[PDB]
Amino acid sequence: FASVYAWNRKRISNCVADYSVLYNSASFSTFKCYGVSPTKLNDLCFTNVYADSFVIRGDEVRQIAPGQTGKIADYNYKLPDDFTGCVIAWNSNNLDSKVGGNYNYLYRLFRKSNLKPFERDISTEIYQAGSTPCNGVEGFNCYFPLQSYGFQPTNGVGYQPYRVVVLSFELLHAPATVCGPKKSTNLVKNKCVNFNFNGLTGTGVLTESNKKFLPFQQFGRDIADTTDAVRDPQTLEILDITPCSFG
Amino acid sequence: QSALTQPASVSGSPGQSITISCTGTSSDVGGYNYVSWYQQHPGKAPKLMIYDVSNRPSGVSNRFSGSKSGNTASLTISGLQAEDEADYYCSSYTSSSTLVVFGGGTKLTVLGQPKAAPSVTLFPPSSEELQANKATLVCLISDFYPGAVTVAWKADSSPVKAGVETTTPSKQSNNKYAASSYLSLTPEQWKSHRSYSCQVTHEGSTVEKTVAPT
Amino acid sequence: QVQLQESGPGLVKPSETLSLTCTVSGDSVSSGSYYWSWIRQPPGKGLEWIGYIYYSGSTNYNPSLKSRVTISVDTSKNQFSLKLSSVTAADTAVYYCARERCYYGSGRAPRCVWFDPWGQGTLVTVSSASTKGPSVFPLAPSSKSTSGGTAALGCLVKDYFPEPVTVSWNSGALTSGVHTFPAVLQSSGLYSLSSVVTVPSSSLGTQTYICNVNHKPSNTKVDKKVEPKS
Numbered sequence: 098f099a100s101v102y103a104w105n106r107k108r109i110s111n112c113v114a115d116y117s118v119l120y121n122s123a124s125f126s127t128f129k130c131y132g133v134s135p136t137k138l139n140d141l142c143f144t145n146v147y148a149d150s151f152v153i154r155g156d157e158v159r160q161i162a163p164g165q166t167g168k169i170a171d172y173n174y175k176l177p178d179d180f181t182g183c184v185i186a187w188n189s190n191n192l193d194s195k196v197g198g199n200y201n202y203l204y205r206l207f208r209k210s211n212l213k214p215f216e217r218d219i220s221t222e223i224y225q226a227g228s229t230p231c232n233g234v235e236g237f238n239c240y241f242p243l244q245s246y247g248f249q250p251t252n253g254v255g256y257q258p259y260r261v262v263v264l265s266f267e268l269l270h271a272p273a274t275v276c277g278p279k280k281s282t283n284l285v286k287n288k289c290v291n292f293n294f295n296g297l298t299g300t301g302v303l304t305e306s307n308k309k310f311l312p313f314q315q316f317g318r319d320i321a322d323t324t325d326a327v328r329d330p331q332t333l334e335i336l337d338i339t340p341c342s343f344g
Numbered sequence: 345q346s347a348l349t350q351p352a353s354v355s356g357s358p359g360q361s362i363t364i365s366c367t368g369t370s371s372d373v374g375g376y377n378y379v380s381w382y383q384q385h386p387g388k389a390p391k392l393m394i395y396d397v398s399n400r401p402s403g404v405s406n407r408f409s410g411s412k413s414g415n416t417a418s419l420t421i422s423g424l425q426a427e428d429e430a431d432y433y434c435s436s437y438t439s440s441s442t443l444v445v446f447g448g449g450t451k452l453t454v455l456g457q458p459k460a461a462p463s464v465t466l467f468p469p470s471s472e473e474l475q476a477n478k479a480t481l482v483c484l485i486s487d488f489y490p491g492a493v494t495v496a497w498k499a500d501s502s503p504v505k506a507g508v509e510t511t512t513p514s515k516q517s518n519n520k521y522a523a524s525s526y527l528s529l530t531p532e533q534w535k536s537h538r539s540y541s542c543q544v545t546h547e548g549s550t551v552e553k554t555v556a557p558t
Numbered sequence: 559q560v561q562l563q564e565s566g567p568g569l570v571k572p573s574e575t576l577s578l579t580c581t582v583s584g585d586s587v588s589s590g591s592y593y594w595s596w597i598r599q600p601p602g603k604g605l606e607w608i609g610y611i612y613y614s615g616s617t618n619y620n621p622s623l624k625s626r627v628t629i630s631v632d633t634s635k636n637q638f639s640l641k642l643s644s645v646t647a648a649d650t651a652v653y654y655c656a657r658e659r660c661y662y663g664s665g666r667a668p669r670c671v672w673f674d675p676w677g678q679g680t681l682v683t684v685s686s687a688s689t690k691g692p693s694v695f696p697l698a699p700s701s702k703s704t705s706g707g708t709a710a711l712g713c714l715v716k717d718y719f720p721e722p723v724t725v726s727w728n729s730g731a732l733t734s735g736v737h738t739f740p741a742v743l744q745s746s747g748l749y750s751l752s753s754v755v756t757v758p759s760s761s762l763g764t765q766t767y768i769c770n771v772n773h774k775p776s777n778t779k780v781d782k783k784v785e786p787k788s
Contacts, residue, residue, distance in 0.1 A: 200665040206590050226591070237401070240591055241662035247616060256615065378661070380672040389654055389676035390605075396672070433605060437669045441621045444670065446605045465703060465710060465754070470695040471788070473714075482697060482714060482752055484739060509750075514740045524739040526750065555702050 098193070098260050101151045101173050102205040102243065103219045109146040113278045115139060125187045126259070127158055132181030132266070142276030146182075149174070149263045152193060152202055154246065156255040158186045161263060173205055174263075177214035182265035190250065193258040198247035202258065207242045215265075284329060289341030294327045299338065306335035345369050347434050349447040350416075356424050358456050363420035366434040366447060373436045373445065374415035380435040381410060381419050386515060390433065394419060426519055429454050460520055462488030462546050466553040469534060479534040481527035483542035483553075488513075489520040490547060497527055498541040498554075560584035562655050562677040568775055569689045569720055570645060570682065579639035580655030580677055588613040588633045593658040593670055596629060596640050598651040601681075610658060610670070611638055618667075650683045681722055687747050691776050692718040696769070696784035697752065704759050710735075711784040712754030713769035717746070720775030725753045728766055732757075762786045 099105040116138035120128065128135065153161075153169060160170040163180040170176070193199060207224040225231045227238030235241060248258050284292075286303045293299075297316060306326060310317065317326035317335075326337050347368030356362045366381075368374060379397050384390035393404045397412050410419040417434060434447035463486045469479035485493055491513040497504045507528035513521040525542065539556035561583045570576045580594070587594065595610040609619040611629050619627055629640040642649065655677035660670030692715045699711035715725055727736045738753035757767065768781045 198667065200663070200667065235661055236396070236399070237659070243662065244590070244668070245663070245665065247667060378669065378671040389679050391676070392672055392674075435671065435673075437671050442607070443618060443620075444607050446607060448604045467697045467700075467703065467712075467714075467752075470697055470714070473695045476693075476695075480714070480716070484752070484754060486737070509742050509744055511740050511742050516737075522737070522739060524742060524752065526742060526744075553702075 098152045098189075099150050100203055101153050101169065102203060103217065104149050104151040104174055106217075107148045107150070109148055109275065112275050114146065114275050115278055119185065125185050127186040128183065129162070130183035131163060132179075133183075135183065138183075139277035142273060143266045144269045144271045144274040145267045146275060147265045147267065149265070150261070152189070152258050152260050153204075154255070155188065155257050155259050158259055158261065161186070161261055168206055169204070171211045172208035172218065173212075175212040175214045175216065176263070180265070181267070182263065184261070184263050186259050186261045188254075188257060189260045190252075190257040193260070194248035194250045194252065196250060198249050199258075200245045200247055202248065203243045203245045205242055206244050207240060284336075286336075295330055297324060297327060299324060301338045301340050304337045304339065306337045308335055308337075310335055345373075345438065345440060345442065345445060347373050347417075347436055347445050347447060349432070349434060349450050351450060352448070353451045353453070355453050355455050358424045358426065358454050360424065361420065361422055362424060362452065363418060364432055364450055364452075365416050365418050367416040368434075368436060368445070369438075370415060372438045372440065374412070374417065376437060377412075378435075378437040379410075379412065379417045381408075382433045382435070383430045384433070385430050390431075424454060426454050428452060429515075429519055454519065457489050457519075459547065460487050460489040462486070462493055462544055462551060464542065464544055464551050464553050466542050466555050468540075468555045468557065469529070469531070474531050474534070477531065479529035479531045481529065481540060481542070481555075483525045483527070483544075485523040485525075485544055486516075487518075487520050487522070488546055491521040493521070493523055493544055493546050495523075495525050496543050496545070497525075498543065498552075499537045500539055560657075560675050562657075562675055564653065564655055564677050564680045566639070567680050567682055567722070569687075570684050571686065572645065572647065572684065574645050575641055575643040576645055576682065576684075577639060577641045578653055578655075578680070578682070579637055581635065581637040582657075583636070587631060587636050587638065592674070593660040593668075594631075594638050595656055595658050595673070597654045597656060597676075598649070599654070600648070600651040609640070610660075645684055647684055650685070652679045652681050654679045683721060687719050689720045689775055690718050690748060691778045692716065692723060692771060692773055694769070694771050694780055694782050696782050697754065698784060698787045699757070699762050700787050704762075707758055707760075708735075708756045709759040709762060710754050710756040711767060712752055713771070713782055713784060714750075714752040715771050716750035716752075717744075717748045718750075718773060719748055720773065721749060722775065723749070723751070723771070723773050725751075726770045726772075727753075727755055728768055729770055732767070 120135045157169050160167045161184050163176050163178050223231045223233055224240045224242045231239035289302055291300050315328055316324055319325045326335055328335050350365040350367055377397050380392055381394040382390040382392050393408045394410045398410050407422045429452055432450045436445045438445055465484045467482040495510055497508050510525040511523045513523045516522055535557050541552055541554035543552035564578055564580050566577050566579045593610045593612050596608040599605045609629050611617055611631055627642045631638045657674045658670040659672050660668050663669050695714045697712045697714055699709045703710045713725055735756040741749040741751035743749055763785050768783045771780045
């Protein structure tokens with residue numbers, strides 16, 4: 098994973114996202130959704146999804162939430178106050194903690210001012226607590242700004258490492274982007290049916306055709322403008338649409 | 345491991361310069377840049393005046409300074425005073441396991457003073473103690489800078505050697521010494537002999553005080 | 559500025575688990591930036607280091623005293639405390655509490671140095687001589703103590719085991735001539751001392767001279783007036 102003071106930032110993009118494999122995986126110790134309850138994720142579409150990744154203590158997972166304070170949310174990773182995404186977290190004691198102490202996971206514990214939301218700060222300047230200038234050397238009121246979790250496998254819970262992923266769905270002003278996946282079924286024929294062909298919603302009897310579209314045309318229309326033929330997306334065959342009987 | 349504070353004791357003349365060394369093991373104590381020094385007055389918590397390896401914190405005398413050479417660390421003074429008699433310890437950040445090591449201690453002495461006179465003061469057992477079926481004579485000695493005092497106790501004419509306890513000399517603020525001795529007596533022995541006395545000998549010289557029961 | 563004070567004494571027996579408690583004032587514990595520690599010193603001997611706690615809960619100990627000492631933090635009263643179990647007779651020492659500076663390491667524990675403000679140090683002894691309260695007498699000012707312009711009077715506080723004992727003059731008023739002499743250890747096994755102060759001979763009985771005796775391991779507090787002999 099990535100440190101807590103330099104988190105990562107992956108920009109998931111145009112794709113088919115299935116948040117159900119996440120939501121029901123039961124391997125996550127924390128799955129909170131804020132802008133939007135979890136079950137309705139596989140039914141919405143946004144412009145961009147960002148995924149941020151890092152590693153923290155066990156009992157600092159409560160500062161990854163909109164409107165908190167503490168050494169982590171103050172100056173390591175700040176979430177805006179109208180967050181939209183979801184926060185996922187799971188214990189990782191066996192991977193990240195090693196006997197003798199894993200001193201490779203640092204965090205920032207001194208900063209001049211709290212972070213703006215989604216702001217990032219990887220500098221390593223000597224912090225200056227008191228009024229006396231520091232001149233790049235340590236001493237009283239001149240502190241190195243990074244400390245390290247010394248993780249060890251015999252730590253009580255709440256001191257073992259947790260891995261965290263923060264998904265943030267954003268909606269700029271584009272034309273569209275990633276959305277969930279739509280199920281399907283088999284196509285039946287010769288029965289008045291209620292059909293949906295990747296957007297085309299209708300009713301009627303479906304029948305094998307003998308017309309020939311051009312190999313970029315989806316459906317055909319009549320004079321007076323009513324849909325009367327479609328092409329099946331999967332098998333790519335033309336089917337006529339006749340209404341079912343009334344009188 | 346332990347960074348032997350070079351020498352245990354140390355003598356010095358008031359005014360010129362004293363340098364205290366501090367050697368230890370290898371670059372885990374010498375070849376680092378983290379050593380400190382502490383001054384502990386007798387009967388007080390110690391106090392740093394030198395850190396990192398040569399830095400004076402916010403308000404100390406300017407006589408204090410130190411340096412580093414190889415596996416030895418040095419601490420020097422540039423003019424002595426009578427108030428600088430204390431112990432001195434070294435610190436150090438190793439890599440072994442004992443994390444931080446400590447010195448063994450050096451005693452700084454301010455050789456140079458005028459033979460003082462041991463002021464003696466003697467007290468007989470108070471009245472409540474007489475009613476308490478016991479008796480104790482109290483002999484106090486003070487301000488006798490060279491500390492080789494000894495004491496002898498006297499009944500009316502003879503010396504006594506039973507029931508007496510004698511403190512070892514203790515250094516005061518003025519860097520001279522003080523001591524005390526106690527004599528145990530039953531009140532019937534207190535009134536038995538017509539008078540007792542405490543004598544103290546010091547550099548051949550002697551001073552004695554005497555008290556008689558009422 | 560900052561200050562430190564230790565508490566939780568008592569003539570601890572052998573094979574017990576004693577507990578000292580250092581409290582801080584002038585700086586919060588959970589602030590980072592300083593590491594609170596513990597240092598003992600046996601009498602007439604050099605110092606040695608014990609342990610430290612950081613505000614997170616990270617601990618370290620001396621390997622010679624390992625598996626025997628746990629130190630913990632209270633952030634509610636701004637104090638930290640050690641507990642050393644299975645106490646032998648070698649731990650009769652003076653125990654200071656202090657904070658450390660502890661510079662940043664590099665993926666391998668953090669190194670610390672110099673320290674800062676040392677506690678007050680509370681002598682803690684370990685024996686089987688139990689404890690006892692002091693017996694006090696006033697040593698009256700007398701002409702055998704009088705000489706010219708001044709005369710001396712004092713208080714004799716004797717026969718107590720629990721070493722730390724204090725005698726003040728007039729609730730801490732007189733600082734001139736007040737000298738408390740080192741306690742003496744008798745063959746009986748109990749300590750004894752006497753504190754004396756000189757005062758102008760024109761002022762034998764005139765003003766107040768009351769010695770305030772306080773015994774901290776016990777809870778003895780007695781004020782005794784010293785007056786010229788009858």
